[PDB]
Symmetry: D2
Amino acid sequence: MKVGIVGSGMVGSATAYALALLGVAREVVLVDLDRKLAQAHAEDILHATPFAHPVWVRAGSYGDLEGARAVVLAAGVAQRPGETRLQLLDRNAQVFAQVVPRVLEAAPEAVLLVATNPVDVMTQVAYRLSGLPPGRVVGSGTILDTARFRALLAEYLRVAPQSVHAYVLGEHGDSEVLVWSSAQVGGVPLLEFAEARGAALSPEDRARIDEGVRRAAYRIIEGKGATYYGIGAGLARLVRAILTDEKGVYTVSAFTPEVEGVLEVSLSLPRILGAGGVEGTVYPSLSPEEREALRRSAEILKEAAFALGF
Amino acid sequence: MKVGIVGSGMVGSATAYALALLGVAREVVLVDLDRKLAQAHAEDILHATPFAHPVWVRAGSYGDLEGARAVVLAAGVAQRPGETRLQLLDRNAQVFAQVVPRVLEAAPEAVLLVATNPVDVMTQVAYRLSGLPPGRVVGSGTILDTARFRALLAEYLRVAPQSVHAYVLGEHGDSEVLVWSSAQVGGVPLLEFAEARGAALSPEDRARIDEGVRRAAYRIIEGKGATYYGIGAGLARLVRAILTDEKGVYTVSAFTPEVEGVLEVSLSLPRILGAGGVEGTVYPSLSPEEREALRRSAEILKEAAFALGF
Amino acid sequence: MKVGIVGSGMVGSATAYALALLGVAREVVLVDLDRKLAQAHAEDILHATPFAHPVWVRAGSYGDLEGARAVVLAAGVAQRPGETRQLLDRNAQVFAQVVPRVLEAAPEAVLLVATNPVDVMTQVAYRLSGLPPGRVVGSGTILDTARFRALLAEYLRVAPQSVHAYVLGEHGDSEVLVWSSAQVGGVPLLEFAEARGAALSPEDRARIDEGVRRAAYRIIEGKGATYYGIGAGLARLVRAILTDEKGVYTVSAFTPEVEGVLEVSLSLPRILGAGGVEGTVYPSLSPEEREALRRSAEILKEAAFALGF
Amino acid sequence: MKVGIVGSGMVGSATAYALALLGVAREVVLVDLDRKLAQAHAEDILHATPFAHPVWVRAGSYGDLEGARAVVLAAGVAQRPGETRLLLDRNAQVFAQVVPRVLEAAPEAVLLVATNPVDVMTQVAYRLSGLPPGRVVGSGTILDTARFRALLAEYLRVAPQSVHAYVLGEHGDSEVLVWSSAQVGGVPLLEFAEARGAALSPEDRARIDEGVRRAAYRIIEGKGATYYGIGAGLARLVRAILTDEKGVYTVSAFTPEVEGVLEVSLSLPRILGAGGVEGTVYPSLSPEEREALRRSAEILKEAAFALGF
């Protein structure tokens, strides 16, 4: 039960903390070029373990990823003046070019878990770089978005979120697609459910659920500079799924052969997440309207990972 | 966070066990006419707590149910030589008429959790007797049956059961309705997801599974006398949701204004379960054969109750 | 993370349940000659799982014990019309069959002896297994030590997990509550009580002694046997074994010498991990608690010697 | 079951995070002047909660602290023109306004002090609260005690849970270690060591001493401050309070007499409960350890009244 995290910044350390507090893995290994930093986060998290579960948290190099069943790639970040946005992506793809092969040299049988933004394009980058089957490279995707979509719905409907079977699709960016038509609470369609519960989802208060799912990420960044604690626990959950061979269903990003006519693009979709990564993809019922939001999204993403040449 | 269980039999005391090992509630009071049987089970369970979570588990009287936010009714006088089932049934309901008003006097705010068999007719007996709102008396109903249904589907589809969104409605018994038609996994019709995996789900495969959930409770009985560990845990999980104001949907048995033309009847439907009992009930999408099977079930149950005097 | 349990009776099955609700083991195999019995309990405990943790509970043959890292021994037989100490002879008769067959399938496993009386039965299992003594372990006196600390924590207004005091010797009448080396906060027990406005009069001490000894009594009468208790503590001992805890529990195991008494299984504070008990921690007894433990060891030994062990 | 955290810094939020992942609490309220920063931490953490336990996490004014059993006092940073003084100067002018503003909303709460220099800031909190001295509680040397045990455990090959040893006094350079009253499974440490083979060398003790004292060194070197470890430590104290655990933890609290030093606050082994520390235990010592404690104590008193407390 060993997990590696390349990139010992806020996202990766939060993940390590999440893993260690949730007692999911028995060994988390932090790897960063800032071996000093890697070491501080690791030793800090380790000092937490006496007050949680016994998990051996430690910093290392690529060679100590040996045996790790899943390795979280959260190793992007850079400067932000000054330089443009497609230029930050250009230099993060450079890092994957440097980090991917090296991680595969140590943990070839591991599941790659991309967590560097833009999640989806980087996931694409990592898949083609890795030379692995498509189901082994997995991006965080819209798992935090799906949870927010459910959280807002669960608030509006006055029920538990675990009981709101709905999803966010495609991009983890301002082009995601909220699934309403096939959504479901209690065996009844979601839009239908919200009438007996005396609270019809008007196109108004249901387009604000949209720019609430789309804007959640920003209110944080604009408020404290970065986003970490949330994606960290979500990563730790995906890692738990992989480690336990649970075969849960998550809206994570992965290389997709065909989706809405767009070929060879990576985007979120309901995936069965087990010890071999995605074991199967599910294609939810999509109202003719949302299907449009999917391809439009699935085409943005694809023509993104082309400027990059991927 | 205080929990009462009336009827310290197996099912009674196993619910106390699962409650204490899962560390669900902070205080568990066991009440029985056999004062020493309650005092014995509670002493045993308490010796277990230093090897789990800390729970104050004790045996008391009705007054000690004070401030319990939930009381599980699992009486059931033991059948007598020369007494027919029919007589024992009328006799059990007279223990309920003694129990119910007495617990509700100690904990006028408690949610009633009906365990005794038959659970649908006993849930109706409690409701009539409580003078409480309809959602304040819940019976275990079909939880284990919906679990087992989801589990066999999970074993079959190679997917996490938490991901199989399928319910079992109606009587906890031979007229239970496996609803295949609206069942989803990952936002796709259960039946259609079957080809999105191992080539389909035949009406024989389908019958095999039906038998699977139906014959389930009996094999245990025809092996060790009674089932109680499975129920105990399941029971303990509803009391969690109740204690924690979870508002999550379970297939539990409660009193329903109308189902398929049959009026004022207690059977299981997917319901929102929270701090005040069921807080909503979902009427899940049904096919012709399913609607009918539900009605035959709804009427079977109505008559049972009606003959009994409720 | 596989666990065996031979004896799908009330103790063995309670153990299975406790394991499932606590999520230690990933797989729990119940083995009993009443195949339907084992089947029933397993199936029952299976249904409990979706409401706690995923652990595959099943029933099987000695064969299916392959790769178990601990096998709980809770076998035993029917009391039978008019018998007594020869129910005790008949139980050792059972271990004679159980023990080789359990090790034949899972040779690396730690044996967790549960069939009462734990001490005498832990003796016979050890002497049957031919293993190193640390690999045959009795449920022992863990429930009592737990209960000693428990009541102690009420009468002291502190946390059970902060009272370090032990019960030793037999799991029964001759058990030794160790009052001397008992400490809380590192500091000595009766000091701490006298600094908490809670000095323990001897009558207080007696009250708590009875509370530890007759706890079997009071349950047994009003319900028949005990199982819910022992089951969880057994579950916790399996936790330590699977996880290589090297934690200190007062379990029963074969001791070369105890206060001059030779080759007797009683409870001492022991270091439990993946190989069974891997160290003894022998606490400062008083002169009074020492001659006490001697008699405990003396009694257990004659007990075993009478049986042929 | 409501926790408030005044100061949405890294320690403030790491603690909120730990609370929410460990399911300690049903509601955590982050309170900070940088309302938009406290808000951003609340939302980021909220988004974590689908993947762990249902905990409500939100930022709010002091007023939103109502009915919270524990408020965590974690303000400031740790490097501005003057190091004790100032910040410790400017930080107790924050405690000057934060402490009564907090009780104006949650007057029934236990104050958990997280702000450095923790032992002094706890005294400041106590003096400012006008509460029973047991209700203001400093984080103290909980992480140092842990590190002391995790090392002895490592060496002695036993579970840390079973190394009953402590780290007293001022949390920092001069933190005396209870090397002599340390026990393991009842029996005292040095004796238990000869037993497990690993006899406990003088040079051995030295290594582990620096190991405890220089514990944060590499963390601070790598990133300037610690927060993950203490966040979890805080979360563990909050749980002890929220549950009335009455367990024993080496925490800082106003003490009337220590080693001859009048009215001062520093870490000692305490019974932490629903209403803060509800007892204190003098562990046995040594002529070396005692003098160590004493001068360490009066360092603090000649820092506290050297500031008016």
